[model samples]
Target chain A: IAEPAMIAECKTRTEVFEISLVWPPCVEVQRCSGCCNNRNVQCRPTQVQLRPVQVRKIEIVRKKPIFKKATVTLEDHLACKCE
Target chain B: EPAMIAECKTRTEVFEISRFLVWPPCVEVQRCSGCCNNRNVQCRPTQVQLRPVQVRKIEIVRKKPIFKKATVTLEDHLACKCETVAA
Candidate 1:
Protein backbone atom coordinates (compact mmCIF):
# COMPACT_ATOMS: atom_id res chain seq x y z
CA ILE A 1 0.00 0.00 0.00
CA ALA A 2 1.21 3.48 -0.84
CA GLU A 3 1.61 5.97 1.95
CA PRO A 4 -1.00 8.73 1.72
CA ALA A 5 1.52 11.55 2.21
CA MET A 6 3.99 10.00 -0.26
CA ILE A 7 1.18 9.41 -2.78
CA ALA A 8 0.73 13.16 -3.21
CA GLU A 9 3.99 13.29 -5.21
CA CYS A 10 3.42 9.85 -6.78
CA LYS A 11 0.23 8.43 -8.27
CA THR A 12 0.30 4.98 -6.54
CA ARG A 13 3.26 4.01 -8.78
CA THR A 14 5.97 1.66 -7.57
CA GLU A 15 9.48 3.07 -7.23
CA VAL A 16 12.41 1.41 -8.97
CA PHE A 17 16.11 2.19 -8.65
CA GLU A 18 17.90 3.57 -11.69
CA ILE A 19 20.82 5.86 -12.34
CA SER A 20 19.71 9.34 -13.29
CA LEU A 21 23.12 10.86 -12.63
CA VAL A 22 25.96 10.23 -15.05
CA TRP A 23 29.43 10.79 -13.59
CA PRO A 24 31.27 11.33 -16.89
CA PRO A 25 34.65 9.78 -17.97
CA CYS A 26 33.52 6.84 -15.83
CA VAL A 27 30.79 6.01 -18.33
CA GLU A 28 27.46 5.57 -16.46
CA VAL A 29 27.54 5.21 -12.69
CA GLN A 30 24.14 3.56 -12.16
CA ARG A 31 22.71 3.58 -8.65
CA CYS A 32 19.31 1.99 -8.13
CA SER A 33 17.37 4.17 -5.71
CA GLY A 34 14.60 6.80 -5.30
CA CYS A 35 13.17 7.17 -8.80
CA CYS A 36 9.69 8.33 -9.74
CA ASN A 37 9.57 7.78 -13.56
CA ASN A 38 7.40 10.91 -13.56
CA ARG A 39 8.17 14.59 -13.42
CA ASN A 40 11.48 15.78 -11.90
CA VAL A 41 14.09 14.32 -14.32
CA GLN A 42 16.47 13.59 -11.45
CA CYS A 43 13.81 11.37 -9.94
CA ARG A 44 13.40 9.41 -13.18
CA PRO A 45 15.50 6.25 -13.51
CA THR A 46 17.28 4.72 -16.49
CA GLN A 47 17.43 0.96 -17.02
CA VAL A 48 20.82 -0.56 -17.92
CA GLN A 49 22.19 -4.06 -18.62
CA LEU A 50 25.83 -5.01 -17.87
CA ARG A 51 28.07 -7.39 -19.77
CA PRO A 52 30.83 -9.70 -18.40
CA VAL A 53 29.44 -11.13 -15.16
CA GLN A 54 32.63 -11.28 -13.10
CA VAL A 55 36.06 -9.62 -13.29
CA ARG A 56 37.86 -12.93 -12.71
CA LYS A 57 35.96 -14.53 -15.61
CA ILE A 58 36.92 -11.65 -17.89
CA GLU A 59 40.50 -11.60 -16.59
CA ILE A 60 41.06 -15.32 -17.12
CA VAL A 61 40.22 -15.11 -20.82
CA ARG A 62 41.73 -11.68 -21.44
CA LYS A 63 44.84 -12.57 -19.39
CA LYS A 64 44.44 -9.34 -17.48
CA PRO A 65 46.11 -8.67 -14.15
CA ILE A 66 43.98 -8.04 -11.05
CA PHE A 67 45.19 -4.63 -9.98
CA LYS A 68 43.67 -2.59 -7.14
CA LYS A 69 40.17 -1.68 -8.29
CA ALA A 70 36.73 -0.88 -6.88
CA THR A 71 33.52 -1.02 -8.94
CA VAL A 72 29.78 -0.62 -8.24
CA THR A 73 27.31 -2.56 -10.34
CA LEU A 74 23.50 -2.45 -10.28
CA GLU A 75 21.51 -5.68 -10.35
CA ASP A 76 18.07 -5.65 -11.99
CA HIS A 77 15.28 -8.20 -11.62
CA LEU A 78 11.52 -8.36 -11.85
CA ALA A 79 9.86 -6.81 -8.81
CA CYS A 80 6.21 -6.61 -7.82
CA LYS A 81 4.29 -3.41 -8.47
CA CYS A 82 2.59 -3.26 -5.09
CA GLU A 83 0.84 0.01 -4.42
CA GLU B 1 86.71 -7.14 14.05
CA PRO B 2 85.22 -5.53 17.21
CA ALA B 3 83.28 -2.87 15.20
CA MET B 4 81.88 -5.50 12.77
CA ILE B 5 80.87 -7.76 15.71
CA ALA B 6 78.93 -4.96 17.44
CA GLU B 7 77.10 -3.99 14.17
CA CYS B 8 76.15 -7.66 13.54
CA LYS B 9 74.71 -8.05 17.10
CA THR B 10 72.72 -4.78 16.72
CA ARG B 11 71.31 -5.90 13.31
CA THR B 12 70.34 -9.33 14.71
CA GLU B 13 68.59 -7.80 17.76
CA VAL B 14 66.65 -5.31 15.57
CA PHE B 15 65.45 -8.12 13.25
CA GLU B 16 64.41 -10.30 16.23
CA ILE B 17 62.43 -7.44 17.83
CA SER B 18 60.69 -6.55 14.55
CA ARG B 19 59.79 -10.18 13.83
CA PHE B 20 58.76 -11.23 17.37
CA LEU B 21 57.72 -8.10 19.31
CA VAL B 22 55.97 -6.24 16.50
CA TRP B 23 52.32 -7.24 17.08
CA PRO B 24 50.31 -4.38 15.59
CA PRO B 25 46.59 -3.97 16.35
CA CYS B 26 43.88 -4.50 13.76
CA VAL B 27 41.07 -1.93 13.63
CA GLU B 28 37.96 -1.51 11.48
CA VAL B 29 37.77 1.71 9.49
CA GLN B 30 34.52 3.59 8.95
CA ARG B 31 34.44 5.08 5.45
CA CYS B 32 33.06 8.60 5.56
CA SER B 33 33.69 11.92 3.88
CA GLY B 34 34.39 15.45 5.33
CA CYS B 35 38.14 14.86 5.96
CA CYS B 36 37.43 12.60 9.00
CA ASN B 37 40.50 10.98 10.62
CA ASN B 38 41.58 9.05 13.74
CA ARG B 39 44.77 7.96 15.53
CA ASN B 40 46.79 5.22 13.77
CA VAL B 41 44.28 5.36 10.92
CA GLN B 42 45.17 6.08 7.27
CA CYS B 43 43.39 8.82 5.37
CA ARG B 44 41.32 8.09 2.29
CA PRO B 45 40.95 10.22 -0.83
CA THR B 46 39.62 13.75 -0.82
CA GLN B 47 35.82 13.85 -0.86
CA VAL B 48 34.07 15.54 -3.74
CA GLN B 49 31.75 18.42 -2.84
CA LEU B 50 28.76 19.27 -5.00
CA ARG B 51 29.08 22.90 -6.04
CA PRO B 52 26.63 25.04 -7.96
CA VAL B 53 28.91 25.12 -10.99
CA GLN B 54 29.58 21.38 -10.77
CA VAL B 55 25.87 20.62 -10.34
CA ARG B 56 24.50 18.91 -13.45
CA LYS B 57 21.00 19.33 -14.83
CA ILE B 58 19.28 16.75 -17.05
CA GLU B 59 16.09 16.93 -19.11
CA ILE B 60 13.81 13.91 -18.84
CA VAL B 61 11.36 12.55 -21.42
CA ARG B 62 8.35 10.67 -20.00
CA LYS B 63 7.64 7.45 -21.88
CA LYS B 64 4.21 5.82 -22.14
CA PRO B 65 4.10 2.06 -21.58
CA ILE B 66 3.14 0.01 -24.66
CA PHE B 67 0.54 -2.47 -23.42
CA LYS B 68 1.01 -5.04 -26.17
CA LYS B 69 -0.01 -8.29 -24.58
CA ALA B 70 -3.00 -9.06 -22.34
CA THR B 71 -2.43 -12.61 -21.22
CA VAL B 72 -3.00 -14.39 -17.89
CA THR B 73 -1.55 -17.69 -16.64
CA LEU B 74 -3.10 -19.74 -13.82
CA GLU B 75 -0.74 -20.45 -10.92
CA ASP B 76 -2.56 -23.66 -9.86
CA HIS B 77 -2.43 -25.25 -13.38
CA LEU B 78 1.34 -25.90 -13.16
CA ALA B 79 0.97 -29.11 -11.09
CA CYS B 80 -1.71 -30.54 -13.40
CA LYS B 81 0.45 -29.91 -16.50
CA CYS B 82 3.52 -31.56 -14.89
CA GLU B 83 1.56 -34.71 -13.94
CA THR B 84 0.14 -35.19 -17.44
CA VAL B 85 3.43 -34.48 -19.23
CA ALA B 86 5.84 -36.45 -17.05
CA ALA B 87 9.38 -37.11 -18.40
Candidate 2:
Protein backbone atom coordinates (compact mmCIF):
# COMPACT_ATOMS: atom_id res chain seq x y z
CA ILE A 1 0.00 0.00 0.00
CA ALA A 2 1.16 3.53 -0.87
CA GLU A 3 1.20 5.94 2.02
CA PRO A 4 1.29 9.85 1.96
CA ALA A 5 1.21 11.19 -1.64
CA MET A 6 -0.19 10.23 -5.05
CA ILE A 7 0.59 11.81 -8.41
CA ALA A 8 0.40 11.27 -12.20
CA GLU A 9 2.17 12.19 -15.54
CA CYS A 10 5.61 12.99 -14.14
CA LYS A 11 8.49 10.93 -15.52
CA THR A 12 11.37 10.06 -13.16
CA ARG A 13 14.95 9.46 -14.33
CA THR A 14 16.38 6.70 -12.20
CA GLU A 15 19.85 5.55 -11.08
CA VAL A 16 21.04 3.14 -8.43
CA PHE A 17 22.65 4.50 -5.25
CA GLU A 18 25.13 2.49 -3.19
CA ILE A 19 24.74 1.92 0.56
CA SER A 20 27.60 0.94 2.89
CA LEU A 21 27.04 -1.74 5.52
CA VAL A 22 28.33 0.05 8.59
CA TRP A 23 25.64 -1.72 10.57
CA PRO A 24 22.75 -3.22 8.63
CA PRO A 25 23.37 -4.45 5.09
CA CYS A 26 21.88 -3.36 1.72
CA VAL A 27 22.01 -4.19 -2.04
CA GLU A 28 25.45 -2.39 -2.21
CA VAL A 29 23.88 -1.03 -5.40
CA GLN A 30 20.61 -0.49 -3.53
CA ARG A 31 17.90 2.24 -3.71
CA CYS A 32 16.68 4.16 -6.75
CA SER A 33 18.09 7.60 -7.38
CA GLY A 34 16.02 9.69 -9.76
CA CYS A 35 16.20 13.09 -11.32
CA CYS A 36 13.05 15.14 -10.92
CA ASN A 37 12.10 17.96 -13.26
CA ASN A 38 11.37 19.95 -10.09
CA ARG A 39 9.59 22.66 -12.07
CA ASN A 40 7.32 22.77 -9.05
CA VAL A 41 7.95 19.28 -7.64
CA GLN A 42 10.66 17.41 -5.70
CA CYS A 43 11.98 13.87 -5.98
CA ARG A 44 10.87 11.52 -3.21
CA PRO A 45 10.34 7.88 -2.43
CA THR A 46 6.97 6.20 -2.94
CA GLN A 47 7.67 2.92 -1.18
CA VAL A 48 10.13 1.05 1.05
CA GLN A 49 10.85 -2.63 0.61
CA LEU A 50 12.85 -4.76 3.03
CA ARG A 51 15.16 -7.68 2.33
CA PRO A 52 17.85 -9.46 4.38
CA VAL A 53 21.60 -9.49 3.68
CA GLN A 54 24.38 -11.79 4.72
CA VAL A 55 27.14 -10.66 7.07
CA ARG A 56 30.03 -12.36 8.86
CA LYS A 57 29.80 -11.64 12.56
CA ILE A 58 33.29 -12.14 13.90
CA GLU A 59 34.16 -13.07 17.48
CA ILE A 60 35.52 -10.21 19.53
CA VAL A 61 37.92 -12.34 21.55
CA ARG A 62 39.17 -14.49 18.69
CA LYS A 63 38.90 -11.83 15.95
CA LYS A 64 37.90 -14.61 13.57
CA PRO A 65 34.86 -16.41 12.20
CA ILE A 66 33.74 -18.84 14.85
CA PHE A 67 30.05 -18.94 13.92
CA LYS A 68 27.96 -19.22 10.77
CA LYS A 69 27.46 -16.17 8.56
CA ALA A 70 24.06 -14.69 9.30
CA THR A 71 21.61 -12.43 7.56
CA VAL A 72 19.77 -9.37 8.92
CA THR A 73 17.54 -6.71 7.40
CA LEU A 74 17.17 -3.12 8.65
CA GLU A 75 17.39 -0.39 6.00
CA ASP A 76 16.80 1.99 3.00
CA HIS A 77 14.50 3.59 0.31
CA LEU A 78 12.60 2.67 -2.86
CA ALA A 79 10.07 3.52 -5.67
CA CYS A 80 11.47 6.79 -7.01
CA LYS A 81 9.09 9.52 -8.20
CA CYS A 82 8.60 13.24 -8.41
CA GLU A 83 6.06 14.52 -5.96
CA GLU B 1 31.74 17.37 30.11
CA PRO B 2 29.07 17.97 27.44
CA ALA B 3 26.47 20.72 27.77
CA MET B 4 23.09 21.81 26.32
CA ILE B 5 20.51 20.02 24.08
CA ALA B 6 22.14 18.56 20.97
CA GLU B 7 21.10 19.19 17.35
CA CYS B 8 18.60 16.28 17.24
CA LYS B 9 16.75 13.87 19.49
CA THR B 10 14.09 11.13 19.38
CA ARG B 11 10.58 12.34 20.11
CA THR B 12 7.65 10.30 21.46
CA GLU B 13 3.98 11.20 21.29
CA VAL B 14 0.73 9.73 22.55
CA PHE B 15 -2.72 9.99 21.03
CA GLU B 16 -6.11 8.69 22.05
CA ILE B 17 -7.27 6.13 19.50
CA SER B 18 -10.73 4.61 19.69
CA ARG B 19 -11.78 0.88 19.71
CA PHE B 20 -8.24 -0.25 20.58
CA LEU B 21 -9.26 -2.89 23.10
CA VAL B 22 -12.51 -1.02 23.92
CA TRP B 23 -10.98 0.98 26.77
CA PRO B 24 -7.68 2.47 27.92
CA PRO B 25 -7.68 4.30 24.66
CA CYS B 26 -4.36 6.09 24.63
CA VAL B 27 -1.79 4.68 22.24
CA GLU B 28 1.76 5.95 22.31
CA VAL B 29 3.84 5.99 19.16
CA GLN B 30 7.33 7.20 18.32
CA ARG B 31 8.78 9.19 15.45
CA CYS B 32 11.99 10.96 14.42
CA SER B 33 11.51 14.72 14.39
CA GLY B 34 13.38 18.02 14.94
CA CYS B 35 15.91 20.06 13.02
CA CYS B 36 19.22 18.81 11.72
CA ASN B 37 22.34 20.88 12.16
CA ASN B 38 22.64 23.25 9.17
CA ARG B 39 19.59 21.39 7.86
CA ASN B 40 21.83 18.91 6.06
CA VAL B 41 21.31 15.53 7.73
CA GLN B 42 18.29 13.36 7.14
CA CYS B 43 16.90 11.69 10.26
CA ARG B 44 16.67 7.92 9.97
CA PRO B 45 16.78 4.67 11.98
CA THR B 46 18.84 2.52 14.33
CA GLN B 47 17.07 -0.82 14.22
CA VAL B 48 14.06 -2.48 12.62
CA GLN B 49 12.03 -3.92 15.42
CA LEU B 50 8.48 -5.19 14.99
CA ARG B 51 6.22 -5.13 18.00
CA PRO B 52 2.83 -6.78 17.96
CA VAL B 53 -0.08 -4.41 18.42
CA GLN B 54 -3.62 -5.55 19.05
CA VAL B 55 -6.02 -3.57 16.88
CA ARG B 56 -9.45 -4.06 18.28
CA LYS B 57 -12.18 -3.45 15.78
CA ILE B 58 -15.56 -2.91 17.44
CA GLU B 59 -17.44 -6.18 17.45
CA ILE B 60 -20.11 -7.65 19.69
CA VAL B 61 -19.85 -11.33 18.90
CA ARG B 62 -21.78 -12.65 21.91
CA LYS B 63 -20.79 -9.42 23.67
CA LYS B 64 -17.17 -10.49 23.67
CA PRO B 65 -14.30 -8.56 22.15
CA ILE B 66 -12.29 -9.94 19.26
CA PHE B 67 -8.75 -8.70 18.54
CA LYS B 68 -6.66 -8.33 15.45
CA LYS B 69 -2.98 -8.66 16.12
CA ALA B 70 -1.02 -6.41 13.85
CA THR B 71 2.72 -6.20 13.68
CA VAL B 72 3.97 -2.62 13.64
CA THR B 73 7.42 -1.61 12.45
CA LEU B 74 9.65 0.34 14.80
CA GLU B 75 12.44 2.13 13.00
CA ASP B 76 13.50 3.53 16.34
CA HIS B 77 16.11 6.23 16.43
CA LEU B 78 17.92 5.65 19.67
CA ALA B 79 20.42 8.41 18.94
CA CYS B 80 20.69 11.35 16.54
CA LYS B 81 23.69 12.99 14.91
CA CYS B 82 24.79 15.16 12.03
CA GLU B 83 25.85 13.74 8.66
CA THR B 84 26.46 15.88 5.62
CA VAL B 85 23.60 15.47 3.14
CA ALA B 86 21.32 17.80 1.19
CA ALA B 87 18.74 19.61 3.24
User: Highest lDDT, which number?
Assistant: 2
- Give Cα distance to truth, residue B49, candidate 1, Å: 8.2
Mind giving the per-residue lDDT tens digits that candidate 1 earns over A2-83? 1111111211222222222121111212232322333223333244455321111123335765343234353432222212
fnat, candidate 1? 0.00
Native interface contact recovery, all models: 0.00, 0.00
**What overall lDDT goes with each candidate model?**
0.21, 0.40
- Residue B87 CA displacement from its true place in model 1, Å: 55
TM-scores of all candidate predictions against the true structure: 0.16, 0.33
- Clash statistics: count for each candidate: 1, 0
Which consecutive 10 residues in model 2 chain B have the weakest lDDT in total? B1-10
Cα error, candidate 1, residue B29 (Å): 23
Top model number, TM-score = 2
